Curated annotation (Swiss-Prot), chain A:
One of its GO terms (biological process) is 7-methylguanosine cap hypermethylation. Core component of the spliceosomal U1, U2, U4 and U5 small nuclear ribonucleoproteins (snRNPs), the building blocks of the spliceosome. Most spliceosomal snRNPs contain a common set of Sm proteins, SNRPB, SNRPD1, SNRPD2, SNRPD3, SNRPE, SNRPF and SNRPG that assemble in a heptameric protein ring on the Sm site of the small nuclear RNA to form the core snRNP. Component of the U1 snRNP. The U1 snRNP is composed of the U1 snRNA and the 7 core Sm proteins SNRPB, SNRPD1, SNRPD2, SNRPD3, SNRPE, SNRPF and SNRPG, and at least three U1 snRNP-specific proteins SNRNP70/U1-70K, SNRPA/U1-A and SNRPC/U1-C. It is found in: Cytoplasm, Cytosol; Nucleus. This is Small nuclear ribonucleoprotein Sm D3. GO terms for molecular function: enzyme binding; histone pre-mRNA DCP binding; RNA binding; telomerase RNA binding; U7 snRNA binding. Keywords: Acetylation, Cytoplasm, Methylation, mRNA processing, mRNA splicing, Nucleus, Repeat, Ribonucleoprotein, RNA-binding, Spliceosome. Methylated on arginine residues by PRMT5 and PRMT7; probable asymmetric dimethylation which is required for assembly and biogenesis of snRNPs. In the autoimmune disease systemic lupus erythematosus, antinuclear antibodies are developed with Sm specificity.
Curated annotation (Swiss-Prot), chain B:
This is Small nuclear ribonucleoprotein G. Core component of the spliceosomal U1, U2, U4 and U5 small nuclear ribonucleoproteins (snRNPs), the building blocks of the spliceosome. Most spliceosomal snRNPs contain a common set of Sm proteins, SNRPB, SNRPD1, SNRPD2, SNRPD3, SNRPE, SNRPF and SNRPG that assemble in a heptameric protein ring on the Sm site of the small nuclear RNA to form the core snRNP. Component of the U1 snRNP. The U1 snRNP is composed of the U1 snRNA and the 7 core Sm proteins SNRPB, SNRPD1, SNRPD2, SNRPD3, SNRPE, SNRPF and SNRPG, and at least three U1 snRNP-specific proteins SNRNP70/U1-70K, SNRPA/U1-A and SNRPC/U1-C. It holds the Pfam family LSM. The keyword Ion transport does not apply. The gene is SNRPG. The keyword Ribonucleoprotein applies. It comes from Homo sapiens. Residues 1-73 form the Sm domain. Belongs to the snRNP Sm proteins family. PANTHER family: SMALL NUCLEAR RIBONUCLEOPROTEIN (PTHR10553), SMALL NUCLEAR RIBONUCLEOPROTEIN G-RELATED (PTHR10553:SF26). GO terms for biological process: 7-methylguanosine cap hypermethylation; mRNA splicing, via spliceosome; RNA splicing; spliceosomal complex assembly; spliceosomal snRNP assembly; U2-type prespliceosome assembly. InterPro entries: Lsm7/SmG-like, LSM_dom_sf, Sm, Sm_dom_euk/arc, Sm_G.
From Swiss-Prot, chain G:
It comes from the Eukaryota. The gene is SNRPB. Core component of the spliceosomal U1, U2, U4 and U5 small nuclear ribonucleoproteins (snRNPs), the building blocks of the spliceosome. Most spliceosomal snRNPs contain a common set of Sm proteins, SNRPB, SNRPD1, SNRPD2, SNRPD3, SNRPE, SNRPF and SNRPG that assemble in a heptameric protein ring on the Sm site of the small nuclear RNA to form the core snRNP. Component of the U1 snRNP. The U1 snRNP is composed of the U1 snRNA and the 7 core Sm proteins SNRPB, SNRPD1, SNRPD2, SNRPD3, SNRPE, SNRPF and SNRPG, and at least three U1 snRNP-specific proteins SNRNP70/U1-70K, SNRPA/U1-A and SNRPC/U1-C. It is found in: Cytoplasm, Cytosol; Nucleus. Plays a role in pre-mRNA splicing as a core component of the spliceosomal U1, U2, U4 and U5 small nuclear ribonucleoproteins (snRNPs), the building blocks of the spliceosome. Component of both the pre-catalytic spliceosome B complex and activated spliceosome C complexes. As a component of the minor spliceosome, involved in the splicing of U12-type introns in pre-mRNAs. As part of the U7 snRNP it is involved in histone pre-mRNA 3'-end processing. This is Small nuclear ribonucleoprotein-associated proteins B and B'. The chain holds residues 6 to 87 of 240 of the full protein. Belongs to the snRNP SmB/SmN family. Residues 1-81 form the Sm domain. Methylated by PRMT5. It comes from Homo sapiens.
From Swiss-Prot, chain H:
Belongs to the snRNP Sm proteins family. SmF/LSm6 subfamily. The gene is SNRPF. GO terms for cellular component: catalytic step 2 spliceosome; cytosol; methylosome; nucleoplasm; nucleus; pICln-Sm protein complex; small nuclear ribonucleoprotein complex; SMN-Sm protein complex. The lineage of its organism: Eukaryota, Metazoa, Chordata, Craniata, Vertebrata. It comes from the Eukaryota. Core component of the spliceosomal U1, U2, U4 and U5 small nuclear ribonucleoproteins (snRNPs), the building blocks of the spliceosome. Most spliceosomal snRNPs contain a common set of Sm proteins, SNRPB, SNRPD1, SNRPD2, SNRPD3, SNRPE, SNRPF and SNRPG that assemble in a heptameric protein ring on the Sm site of the small nuclear RNA to form the core snRNP. Component of the U1 snRNP. The U1 snRNP is composed of the U1 snRNA and the 7 core Sm proteins SNRPB, SNRPD1, SNRPD2, SNRPD3, SNRPE, SNRPF and SNRPG, and at least three U1 snRNP-specific proteins SNRNP70/U1-70K, SNRPA/U1-A and SNRPC/U1-C. This is Small nuclear ribonucleoprotein F. It is found in: Cytoplasm, Cytosol; Nucleus. GO terms for molecular function: RNA binding. It comes from Homo sapiens. Keywords: Acetylation, Cytoplasm, mRNA processing, mRNA splicing, Nucleus, Ribonucleoprotein, RNA-binding, Spliceosome. Transmembrane segments: none annotated.
RNA sequence: GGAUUUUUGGAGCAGGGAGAUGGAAUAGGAGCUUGCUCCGUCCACUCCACGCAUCGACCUGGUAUUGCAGUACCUCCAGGAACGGUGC
């Protein structure tokens, strides 16, 4: 049904997170709008494209289908999902 | 069964990374809950700096894993 | 007093200051260096704050080790088989220790991975040409007494004592 | 359930998977073609919609470049296969 | 019916899984759900150009598996 | 600890399944069953049920 | 069944879509089973491109990572629960 | 307008060259490809880059390989 | 606010025009599918007419006729005629 | 509940050329072991087109800042490429 994964994504949206995509497209920035289908909207992000020129763009639409992972708030380690 | 949130970004400029490392520079114009964001005034960007204006690209979210913003909308 | 795998498993193996896996055993005065590999390949730092270890010896095969705290200890000498058991080792911080003479620097050079070291508060400190002996024996070193090594220091340390 | 499995037999039998249907009603040793280029030859013992087939007398071969690739060949008699790694399921090879 | 249910006839069963990343492993898996989800145990795994790496409790995925090998004392018709 | 497998019993059963699986993957015979396995693994130096002039000898050595 | 539901909360090496091993103190599962790995890191092969240079792995830590469901190749335990 | 169903039905049996995702172009008369898009031809030969090379004939492909399908 | 112009609306207007376009592919941006679509369905599995493979690096065009390319290996198209 | 976002998969594969340059002790074939000739897997040096650019971290010396706040990452010049993946 509903995913505590999606609850984690909702607790990771809105602020600085760091998504990592398929070919190395990794965007560290304000993952503003993520919908449970994971098409993450990031804001004011610094994305590498795995290119090592990890350049800063604004309001990117990084799909989550290619998202290898997503570094979330290190302050919600005491989540309500795990607790 | 939920449409995507391209709502304030519609009718505005995005530079998208789709598979094949390709880029589609265009206007957000049309979509479905399948996220198939369709870009008019959309132009291709290849591996080399070559770029062709495509008229109206209905670019499926089947591949496009990125797209950045040109403005604030 | 028995220092066991009780105090090594109950030790804290989690995020260090520089965001690495550190395993603290503070508050034991443990003089026994045994039963450690039960960190289970998920550890890089072994810390024995408040220890009385008769010298530097007694570690298991850790190809991953990235920090070790042997400060506030009873280190008198320096044991031999350190490199093959710490090839990933750069941080073996043994300050507040009691190393005395440059014969305690005999296994210090055989590592290819030593760059971030500390042996502070030892009688090997105020001795003349002690940092010279160090800058001779430690090729790949970068962090020595919390200030960079120098190519001038390396020239001095190679050229002297032929 | 009942009418659904009736239509299901009709689908596996009179549809595209007729190759595996004949491998099951005829006990044929059929070439399951992987999408990853590992040719397994053998029967079809359990088979269904998604091309999920369990093969008996299974023999897997690969083009292994140590050079000029050799046919790496082994034969595990019984072994299962899901239909995702499969590109094809062909009833009849010439061997 | 599907052969996912035929692979559901495997618990305390000596199997061999060739997975998606060039993997080949011997395993007595822990328990398998309807979407092929078969978690390995005491398994000796070797991906492409690898070692016999050991996992005492591991969770081998579904669509990220390629080939499965059942026991020899396993009646096929009785397993499907 | 590691000297006893599941069914082996610390000295009650042994590991013939692994060499049996290796011989199966080698010979690939539609009737290489319990009787043939036990006959090949019981005797000492008969005319073997597989070619020893191939890697079957090395597999027996393993 | 929910097999991992016993082995969660410990540092577990989750495998990747590209063959890495990432020891995160795993939390929870799903129907897609997207991972929420806390105190989580990663490490992959630093390929020498040669043989007289040897192979290692450079250390990366994400902390808490929300690995999308398309990730797992396996999930094994590499750290007991702290 | 000639939708998937009518077009692939008038070509189901017409000798199709069907390009798979690794160079495989089947040359043969399809049996049936229903909504599951599972292909299967009768007396189809293998091709790599359009070179007829194999004789397996009535072979049944998963659609997950299919790049293209045309009736020659 | 603003209303949706479906990608199926794009494909439908293209087919009604019976127009020739070249289409993009997956994991290989070198090759393009130059042809016209004949019809459609609710699935967007692109069916094509008089199509040909056109290579960037190689610079060749191998024609199929009324071909049925995959539906998931589509990305987009440029209407060339 | 195997069709454009996660679990019935686009996965597999191969490292650019050459010089009377070289190592295989325990491991390749034939000329029926040793000697010697040619032959289908790498790395060290050197020639091209240090396989080509970006950037990031670092080693080198010079160089600006004495300052309180929770970090993708914060000096500037210059060298070298010991390391990473991005386009060919």
């Amino acid at each position: 049904s509903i995913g505590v994964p999606i609850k984690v994504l909702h607790e990771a949206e809105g602020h600085i997170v760091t998504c990592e995509t398929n070919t190395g497209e990794v965007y560290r920035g304000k993952l503003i709008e993520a919908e449970d289908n994971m098409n993450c909207q990031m804001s004011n992000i610094t994305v590498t494209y795995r290119d090592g020129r990890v350049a800063q763009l604004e309001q990117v639409y990084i799909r989550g289908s290619k998202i290898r992972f997503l570094i979330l708030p290190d302050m919600l380690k005491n989540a309500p999902m795990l607790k | 069964a939920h449409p995507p949130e391209l709502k304030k970004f519609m009718d505005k400029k995005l530079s998208l990374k789709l598979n094949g490392g390709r880029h589609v520079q265009g206007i957000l114009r049309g979509f479905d809950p399948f996220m198939n964001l369709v870009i008019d005034e959309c132009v291709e960007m290849a591996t080399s700096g070559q770029q062709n204006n495509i008229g109206m690209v209905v670019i499926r979210g089947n591949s496009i894993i990125m797209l950045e913003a040109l403005e604030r909308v | 007093v028995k220092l066991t795998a009780e105090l090594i498993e109950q030790a804290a193996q989690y995020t260090n200051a520089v965001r690495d896996r550190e395993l603290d055993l503070r508050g034991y005065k443990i003089p026994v260096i045994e039963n450690l590999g039960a960190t289970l390949d998920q550890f890089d730092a072994i810390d024995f704050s408040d220890n009385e270890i008769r010298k530097l010896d007694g570690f298991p095969l850790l190809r991953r080790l990235k920090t070790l705290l042997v400060n506030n200890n009873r280190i008198c000498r320096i044991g031999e088989g350190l490199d093959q058991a710490l090839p990933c080792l750069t941080e073996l911080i043994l300050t507040n220790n009691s190393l005395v003479e440059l014969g305690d620097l005999d296994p210090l050079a055989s590592l290819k991975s030593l760059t971030y070291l500390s042996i502070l508060r030892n009688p090997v400190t105020n001795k003349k040409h002690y940092r010279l002996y160090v800058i001779y024996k430690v090729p790949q070193v970068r962090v020595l007494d919390f200030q960079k090594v120098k190519l001038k220091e390396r020239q001095e340390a190679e050229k002297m004592f032929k | 359930p009942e009418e659904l499995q009736k239509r299901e037999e009709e689908e596996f039998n009179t549809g595209p998977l007729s190759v595996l249907t004949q491998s099951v009603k005829n006990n044929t040793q059929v070439l399951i073609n992987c999408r990853n280029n590992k040719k397994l030859l053998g029967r079809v013992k359990a088979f269904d919609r998604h091309c999920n087939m369990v093969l008996e007398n299974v023999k897997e071969m690969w083009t292994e470049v140590p050079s000029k690739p050799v046919n790496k060949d082994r034969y595990i008699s019984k072994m299962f296969l899901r239909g995702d790694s499969v590109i094809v399921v062909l009833r009849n090879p010439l061997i | 019916m599907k052969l996912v249910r035929f692979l559901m006839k495997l618990s305390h069963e000596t199997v061999t899984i060739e997975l998606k990343n060039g993997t080949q492993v011997h395993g007595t898996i822990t328990g398998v759900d309807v979407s092929m989800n078969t978690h390995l145990k005491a398994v000796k795994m070797t991906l492409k150009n690898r070692e016999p790496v050991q996992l005492e409790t591991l969770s081998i995925r579904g669509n990220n598996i390629r080939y499965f090998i059942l026991p020899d004392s396993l009646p096929l018709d009785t397993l499907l | 600890l590691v000297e006893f497998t599941d069914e082996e019993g610390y000295g009650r059963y042994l590991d013939l399944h692994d060499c049996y699986l290796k011989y199966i993957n080698l010979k690939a015979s539609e009737k290489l069953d319990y009787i043939t396995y036990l006959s090949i693994f019981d005797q000492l130096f008969d005319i073997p049920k597989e070619r020893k002039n191939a890697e079957y000898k090395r597999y027996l050595e393993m | 069944s929910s097999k991992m539901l016993q082995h969660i909360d410990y540092r577990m090496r989750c495998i990747l879509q590209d063959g890495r091993i990432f020891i995160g103190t795993f939390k929870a599962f799903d129907k897609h089973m997207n991972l929420i790995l806390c105190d989580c890191d990663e490490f992959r092969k630093i390929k020498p491109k040669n043989s007289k240079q040897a192979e290692r792995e450079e250390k990366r830590v994400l902390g808490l990572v929300l690995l999308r469901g398309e990730n797992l190749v396996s999930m094994t335990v590499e750290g007991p629960p702290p | 307008p000639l939708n998937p169903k009518p077009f692939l039905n008038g070509l189901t049996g017409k000798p199709v060259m069907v390009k798979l995702k690794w160079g495989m172009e089947y040359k043969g008369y399809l049996v049936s490809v229903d909504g599951y898009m599972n292909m299967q031809l009768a007396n189809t030969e293998e091709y790599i880059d359009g070179a007829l090379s194999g004789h397996l004939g009535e072979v049944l492909i998963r659609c997950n390989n299919v790049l293209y399908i045309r009736g020659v | 606010q603003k209303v949706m112009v479906q990608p199926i609306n794009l494909i439908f207007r293209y087919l009604q025009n019976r127009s020739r376009i070249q289409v993009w592919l997956y994991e290989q941006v070198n090759m393009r599918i130059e042809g016209c679509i004949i019809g459609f369905d609710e699935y967007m599995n692109l069916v094509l007419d008089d199509a040909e493979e056109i290579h960037s690096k190689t610079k060749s065009r191998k024609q199929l006729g009324r071909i049925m390319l995959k539906g998931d290996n589509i990305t987009l198209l440029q209407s060339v005629s």
